[PDB]
Amino acid sequence: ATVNQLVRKPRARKVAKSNVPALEACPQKRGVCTRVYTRKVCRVRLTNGFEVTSYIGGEGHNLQEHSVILIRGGRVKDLPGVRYHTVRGALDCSGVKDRKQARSKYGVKRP
Amino acid sequence: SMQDPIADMLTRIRNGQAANKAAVTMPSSKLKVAIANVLKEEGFIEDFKVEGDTKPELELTLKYFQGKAVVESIQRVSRPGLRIYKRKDELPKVMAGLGIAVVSTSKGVMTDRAARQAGLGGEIICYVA
Amino acid sequence: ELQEKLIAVNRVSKTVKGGRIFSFTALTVVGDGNGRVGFGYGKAREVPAAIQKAMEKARRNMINVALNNGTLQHPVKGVHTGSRVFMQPASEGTGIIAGGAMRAVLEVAGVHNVLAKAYGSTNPINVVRATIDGLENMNSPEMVAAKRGKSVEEILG
Amino acid sequence: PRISDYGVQLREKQKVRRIYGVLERQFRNYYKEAARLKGNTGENLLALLEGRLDNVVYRMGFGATRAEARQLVSHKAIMVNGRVVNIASYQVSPNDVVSIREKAKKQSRVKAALELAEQREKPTWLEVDAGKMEGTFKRKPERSDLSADINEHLIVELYS
Amino acid sequence: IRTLQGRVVSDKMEKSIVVAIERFVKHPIYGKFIKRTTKLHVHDENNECGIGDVVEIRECRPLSKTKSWTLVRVVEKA
RNA sequence: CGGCCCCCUGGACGAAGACUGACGCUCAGGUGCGAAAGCGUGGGGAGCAAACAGGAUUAGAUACCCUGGUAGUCCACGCCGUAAACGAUGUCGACUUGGAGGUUGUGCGCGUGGCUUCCGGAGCUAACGCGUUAAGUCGACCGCCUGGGGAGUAC
RNA sequence: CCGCAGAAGAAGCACCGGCUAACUCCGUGCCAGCAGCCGCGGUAAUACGGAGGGUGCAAGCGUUAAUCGGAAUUACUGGGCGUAAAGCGCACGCAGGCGGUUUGUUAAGUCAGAUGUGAAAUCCCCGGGCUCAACCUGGGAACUGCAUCUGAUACUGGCAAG
RNA sequence: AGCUAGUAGGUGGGGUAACGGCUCACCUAGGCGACGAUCCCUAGCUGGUCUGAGAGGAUGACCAGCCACACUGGAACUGAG
Ligand SMILES: [Mg+2]
């Protein structure tokens, strides 16, 4: 239908924005875990300074306020503006101890 | 202003079959009497006549079978704003051969089966089922 | 040799001055081994009672239609209450390719080679009514030859 | 407890996987080549699964267990056209020749198991001989000669 | 001989002719036949054309910048 | 857009006779008109009445109620291009059961046209409903849509 | 290829309320925590953690990131605009798209036939050797798209015209 | 949303392996453009890969065909290139 108008102005397919709007086409990106407290979030300035919010899971609240961490993409569905998750088990990020189940989660070593 | 007399004839006979009328009159033309002749040859109507001299009138009577319309779906596939031309090898099979389609080809007016058996294609205009 | 396949169980709820009265509705289609299909929409306060009511309704309204060795005579388009379904014949080595409700109703009808796709809405009652109306509107070469006045050999070629 | 159609589909699938000792990716490639294959898919896939080398050794009778059959195949005790085959997924062509290695002639436990299998059942194809340690393929496996408790429709719908 | 037929636009170029041809092409994604006014530069002999006349064009060796065309026949007599 | 009259003038419709012989339809851009409010200049200003003041109910009332009253509402010349500018239904055509009517003609006490109101058959939608003035079947073209807020918002 | 030896040295990953495959016990009291979605924690959480078992995969298994489909969710095939998003406030008008009916002619669009041309590898089919397979390889087909020549005139184009 | 002045063409000369505003001198006053000129952003292209019932969409590493480049920017010599 309306083929004259369609050939005058072509049908433009709608763009699709990424759910992770910071450092796209990258699975894990680095950053400095500034403000590791309030209430379980870090304000992470990444390798280019996109300044995302990230959620910390498990133990390790004594992580350094200037600590190199890795960030993966994930929405928590419980807090506003939290669209990123800390990758527990990466470099300078102490894995959650006393968690012997879900080994791939938190980067815990088994005995 | 009317821009498609063939489509006007098709929608006239379609709503006439929907209303269960007896006969329908319309202005005439060469392609109109040709498509009426090939429709009668395919066997969807009984007959059609031409009345008058200065204004030719194609008076045609409709067909009904068991209290139902003989035709079910008539659709103009070659619109006057969107023409359709398909070659012989890609001629469609309306309802896998159960329906029919009119094709205006180089040897006059015929159907899809007649075009396949003659060996040439053209502007496929309407689907009748 | 009839078959038994339920396709939809829902929990409706009405409101009364005392509170809420919950009820169970059951859509279930049945049919014979070839051609005759019928769907039933029962509603009660108990699940097996609603199932049996839907079964009796379907056995009452079991409609009849023909086919051609486990496939459609021609591609049909079933449109009803906002549900577009596309019934299309297939080759022998295909099987039954349809949705959930369409796959169930075609496996009940007993076809062997039918490809299909359900557009529009995804309501089970609407898609089963759409495919029933499509199968009912589907005609046969013998009846179209009797309606056009020609023979089956003239209509096949 | 009663699971639905998808559940019983995956239950029959894992039942076939357990009774044949076949992993999931192997059966997935089996389904791929079966859908590539001509004619039907499910029963031809069952014919291919019967044409599995460990299954063909078990049903010829050189071992009454597919585990020890795979052990013997890995130890290269089956000579087709004189040459050994270590790979358990080798397909056997019809009217071929298979033989047992001379080092595998020191065999008593699986020979008594072959006698037990002769006491149990006797199929149509897969002519076997305990003395000469030889064997050949008669013809294709029949769909009726195929055993029971196998359904192809739910399998091809689960993997379709 | 592979000549084409076209229509000129202007003839005020001091022994140079700008022609324009039209073609009906089926749209590859829409199917509606549209027009394509392809304009070309043609070299003539002694200005044997006017404004808006139908002529025939032939491809030849390059004679100027993006002008490798010569006039064959004029079927309008302008 | 309605007190009457005069003058100037547009459009519509009807029954017939003659002539031009497709001069036709939508229109992106452009042009014109375009309710009320408001703006500029010059007038006028009875009544109404934004703003504002006072008195009242009220816990408070910057509101709904009264007392007054500026702008505006009135005229002329130019802007203002916005409305729930709606029939929430773009324009031009063809065909497809009927009742109840209204207005306005023309022809033979009756026939056929133009516009319009209400309900309903088929048909169409999710239903409400539309239904010969279709939201039925179609044909031509333009405009607009594609989750809400942000937002008809910033540059 | 041949021997030898103590099976000798050779196994984990995710999940068990549902979608989606499979359960109990203890800690636990909106607390730590889980979570793709519905979302869970009311001193009894089949949903957090620990124990067993089972489930699924297997030298891999979970998570993240990127693309297509599902999505008819940009609809040519394959949608709408009365009330859900969506008919410009209305009219006139240029380019442009469409054009009532018949004759003569052109084949520009249209179709038919023929020829040349679409590198080679992938892709589909028939075979071969890699212990089978992955891999590579021979033949056929596909690459139907493009260009040139000869014919047709039903229709859409143009002119002469009624 | 207008752009272009060697711009578009012609005549004569030069030069290039080779036609040609390629380059000069003189004339003509034009050429392109809502079928998108000009400007801005992005980007090597194709056979192909993935996905899709199809039509399509995304994507050009490793395998090949073509183009461009060798810190950046200008050039020319040798050489058939
Ligand atoms: Mg007052």
Multimerization state:
part of a larger assembly
Order of helices and strands of chain E: EEEEEEE
Say how many strands of chain E there are.
7
Structural class of chain E: mainly beta
Number of domains of chain C: 2
Report the C-alpha radius of gyration of chain E, rounded: 14 Å
The major pleated sheet of chain C works out as: 4 strands, mixed
In the CATH scheme, the class of the largest domain in chain C would be Alpha Beta
Q: Any idea what the shape of chain E is?
A: globular
Number of separate structural domains of chain E: 1
- State the strand order across the main sheet of chain E: 5-2-1-6-7
What can be said about the biggest beta sheet of chain E?
5 strands, antiparallel
Number of strands of chain C: 7
Strand adjacency order, main sheet of chain C: 4-5-7-6
Small molecules (ligands, ions, cofactors) in the structure? magnesium ion
Percent of residues in helices of chain E comes to: under 10%
Task: Give me the secondary-structure topology.
This is part of a larger assembly, with chains A (111 residues), B (129 residues), C (157 residues), D (160 residues) and E (78 residues).
Chain B: H1 5-19, E1 23-24, H2 30-42, E2 48-51, E3 57-61, E4 64-65, E5 68-69, E6 74-76, E7 100-105, E8 108-111, H3 112-118, E9 122-128
Antiparallel strand pairs in B: 1-3, 2-3, 4-5, 6-9, 7-8, 7-9
Chain C: E1 5-16, E2 19-31, E3 37-44, H1 47-60, E4 76-79, E5 84-89, E6 96-97, H2 101-109, E7 114-118, H3 124-137, H4 141-148, H5 152-156
Parallel strand pairs in C: 6-7
Antiparallel strand pairs in C: 1-2, 2-3, 4-5, 5-7
Chain D: H1 5-20, H2 24-36, H3 42-50, H4 53-60, H5 66-74, E1 78-80, E2 83-84, E3 97-100, H6 109-120, E4 127-129, E5 134-136, H7 152-158
Antiparallel strand pairs in D: 1-2, 1-3, 3-5, 4-5
Helix pairs in contact in D: 1-7, 2-3, 4-5
The structure holds magnesium ion.
Chain B binds three RNA strands through residues 1-16, 18-21, 24, 26-31, 34, 55-56, 74-76, 78-83, 85, 87-89, 103-110, 119-123, 125.
PDB class: ribosome
Keywords: HIV FSS, frameshifting, ribosome
Entry title: 70S ribosome bound to HIV frameshifting stem-loop (FSS) and P-site tRNA (non-rotated conformation, Structure I)
